Specification:
The protein has helices at about 115, 145-150, 230-235, 305-310, and strands at about 5-10, 15-25, 30-35, 40-45, 70-80, 85-95, 100-110, 125, 155-160, 165-170, 185, 195-205, 210-220, 225, 245, 250-255, 260-265, 270-275, 280, 290, 295, 305, 315-320, 325-330. By secondary structure, the protein is mainly beta. It folds into two domains: about 5-175, Cathepsin D, subunit A, domain 1; about 175-330, Cathepsin D, subunit A, domain 1 (Beta Barrel), CATH 2.40.70.10. It is an enzyme of class 3 (hydrolase).
Length: about 325
């Protein structure tokens, strides 16, 4: 089997992408944030505290003839941005882009943190990291991809995120028309539950490539590119007037600037992030200070190849017995 679904930016900055997901019978379609940095499929629901729902579409398990309470199971998750959610668990039929999994754990939120409530466009998350990170207790549950894998034509999914435009998540096949050149594959460590890999270096604009190992994760659920402070300083030093602002929370730059590209290495291959992809717009409405799309990871503990980096590539998440990642230009 295969599946293919379009993923759409939630706003004009590409802060996140939403993909329609069919849950239950008859189908209830929710728009979920596909997140290769986490491993829970959780949804706003008829059980979510009413004051914490503000415009989201909810899953109502009592209206699904295939829903079953997973007795005794609870979940609770906290994300790298400080947001969180928790609740109980149903199993139900879940379909993405024509690919159907029966008995998928659907984690129904009883509580969500304010950042979720305040984002009416995201109805929940669909985790695509390794199932070892799933938070369901006392019986850990499998991700949608883990449950689908054995049925897929090939045990892979691909992320093809658009810049200020829709893109595609495919399951079970690699669309050879969706990228240019060849796909360069690189080793993955699953020891932390992530799609963790090592970039071979970087360049700023037309500058020379610096060969240096940068360990990080491929994370579709993170908006920005978070890299070591040395790398980030080297980038922003090429933008007149750019500076790190402790009050804003990162590097800002004059909105009048033209940003240089940023290149990252995948083996001997190179992925070029155009400068425009690094502009996240005014820090507040009407400001001439703009927020940068490349930020320091120093306060995180891990480097994160988020959407800024991934949307410059066609990315293969190869879930074979020994997982690997693939990157191609497009």
């Amino acid at each position: 089997s295969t599946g293919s679904a379009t993923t759409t930016p939630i706003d004009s900055l590409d802060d996140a992408y939403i993909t329609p997901v069919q849950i239950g019978t008859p189908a209830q379609t929710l728009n979920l944030d596909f997140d290769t940095g986490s491993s829970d499929l959780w949804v706003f629901s008829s059980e979510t505290t009413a004051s914490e729902v503000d415009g989201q579409t909810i899953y109502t398990p009592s209206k699904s003839t295939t829903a079953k309470l997973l007795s005794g199971a609870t979940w609770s998750i906290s994300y790298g941005d400080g947001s969180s959610s928790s609740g109980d668990v149903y199993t139900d039929t879940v379909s993405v882009g024509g690919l159907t999994v029966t008995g998928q754990a659907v984690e129904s939120a009883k509580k969500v943190s304010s950042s979720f409530t305040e984002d009416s466009t995201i109805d929940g998350l669909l985790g695509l990291a390794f199932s070892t990170l799933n938070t369901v207790s006392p019986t850990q549950q499998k991700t949608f991809f883990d449950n689908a894998k054995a049925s897929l034509d090939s045990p892979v999914f691909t992320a093809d995120l658009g810049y200020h435009a829709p893109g595609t998540y495919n399951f079970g096949f690699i669309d050879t028309t969706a990228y240019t050149g060849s796909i360069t594959y690189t080793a993955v460590s699953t020891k932390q539950g992530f799609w963790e890999w090592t970039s071979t270096g970087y360049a700023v604009g037309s500058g020379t490539f610096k060969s240096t190992s940068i360990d990080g994760i491929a994370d579709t659920g993170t908006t920005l590119l978070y890299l070591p402070a040395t790398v980030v300083s080297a980038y922003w030093a090429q933008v007149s007037g750019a500076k790190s602002s402790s009050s804003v929370g990162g590097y800002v730059f004059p909105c009048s600037a033209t940003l240089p590209s940023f290149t990252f290495g995948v083996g001997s291959a190179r992925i070029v992030i155009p400068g425009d992809y690094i502009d996240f717009g005014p820090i507040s409405t009407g400001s001439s200070s703009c927020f940068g799309g490349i930020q320091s990871s120093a306060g995180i503990g891990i480097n994160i190849f988020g959407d800024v980096a991934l949307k410059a590539a066609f990315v293969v998440f190869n879930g074979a017995t020994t997982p690997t990642l693939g990157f191609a230009s497009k």
